[PDB]
């Protein structure tokens, strides 16, 4: 349980450099310059 | 706490749905790759 | 192990309020409700 906590706070942190180049795709098609 | 972590993980991934809903919304109003 | 488990859950509560801001910045250069 220990690791598997682990994998899915690791699945967190990779989404989370993901979702943090989605924002700035998205905000930067939104034309902020 | 290991399982109130697992739950409250658990409720971090039930946004990733709402957030990928959201982000895809977003970006196909864009009309984007 | 757990303590520095339960701090990388703090920064899932943190980045889940900052991502929920990116988003309505998002919707606000959207011009929406």
Redesign the interface.
């Given at each position: 349980?220990?690791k598997x906590?682990?994998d899915?706070?690791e699945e967190x942190?990779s989404?989370x450099y993901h979702?943090?180049n989605?924002?700035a795709?998205?905000?930067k098609?939104?034309?902020?310059r």
């Amino acid at each position: 349980r220990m690791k598997x906590i682990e994998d899915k706070l690791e699945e967190x942190l990779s989404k989370x450099y993901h979702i943090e180049n989605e924002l700035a795709r998205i905000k930067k098609l939104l034309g902020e310059r």
